[PDB]
Design a protein around this ligand. Structure first.
Ligand SMILES: CC(C)=CCC/C(C)=C/CSP(=O)(O)OP(=O)(O)O
Ligand SMILES: [Mg+2]
Ligand SMILES: [Mg+2]
Length: 274
């Protein structure tokens, strides 16, 4: 109704890719706990999304059919989903390691601060980038099995290239997605990149993002061993990132969005067949 937990299947492989590239061993239990942490964080984030930007999502033509606006769900059920998400996440983090639990409020803070980034500065896309960066970071810090000796080790355990890359990718295709909202997001005090500079300039900034995104995905191939079955995943990904940029400049922006759904499936099946 308000939060479809099925969608989380697309956000999972970014956690596992952060866990594997840390090169620390983890158990099946650890993996299940990772998944749980992810569905919790998704639940909290998605619920509090509809909560925070509600007053300005009722005014929007585009989102007048959203739940919590029409009705369907109450504010109570939504807040309940927030508390439940935070709770599941905290539970997973605690069940995992001491460092995972230690960093869990910070990670949750990031995911819950994003919907307020609009009213502050015209870079919410970067914030989403940090958000889907925190699931990679979380996977890494949870990969250890607390095999780590100190916090100075878990922060060195994180595949920083890939989090800083998936971040820029997300920021990119969100910067693209926010073009249809250029009009609405400037009528009100809302902020975004395609509102600051025109839709053309937005695509330009989007180009700069996805460029640096592909740049890092490639740099990781050398920085790590990454075998030869993940180097086709890097290629297939970098390829897809191009089409979503291609379809964008061609005006067909709606198709430029759904193509971003491929790369999780790409690297997801890439994590499978080890
Ligand atoms: C962060 C992850 C799980 C991937 C992004 C998934 C996705 C469809 C996000 C776009 S929703 P968002 O643009 O933040 O919110 P609205 O503008 O639609 O109100
Ligand atoms: Mg909105
Ligand atoms: Mg938006």
């Amino acid at each position: 109704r308000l939060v479809r937990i099925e969608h989380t299947i697309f956000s999972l492989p970014f956690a596992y890719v952060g866990a594997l590239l840390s090169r620390y061993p983890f158990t099946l239990a650890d993996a299940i706990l990772m998944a749980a942490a992810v569905v919790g964080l998704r639940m909290a984030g998605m619920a509090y999304n509809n909560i925070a930007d509600l007053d300005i999502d009722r005014l929007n033509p585009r989102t007048a059919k959203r739940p919590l606006v029409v009705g369907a769900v109450s504010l109570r059920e939504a807040w309940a989903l927030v508390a439940a998400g935070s709770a599941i996440y905290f539970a997973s983090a605690a069940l995992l390691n001491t460092y995972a639990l230690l960093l869990s409020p910070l990670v949750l803070a990031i995911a819950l601060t994003y919907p307020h980034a609009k009213r502050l500065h015209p870079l919410p896309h970067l914030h989403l980038g940090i958000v889907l960066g925190s699931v990679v970071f979380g996977g890494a810090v949870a990969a250890s099995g607390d095999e780590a000796s100190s916090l100075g080790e878990v922060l060195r355990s994180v595949p920083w290239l890939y989090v800083a890359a998936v971040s820029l990718w997300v920021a990119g295709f969100d910067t693209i997605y926010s073009i249809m909202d250029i009009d609405f997001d400037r009528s009100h005090g809302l902020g975004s990149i395609p509102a600051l500079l025109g839709p053309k300039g937005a695509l330009a900034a989007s180009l700069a993002m996805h460029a640096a995104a592909v740049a890092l995905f490639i740099a990781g191939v050398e920085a790590y061993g990454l075998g030869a079955i993940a180097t086709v995943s890097t290629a297939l990904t970098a390829l897809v990132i191009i089409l979503v940029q291609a379809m964008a400049w061609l005006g067909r922006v709606k198709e430029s969005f759904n193509l971003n759904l491929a790369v999780p499936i790409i690297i997801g099946a890439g994590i499978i067949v080890d």
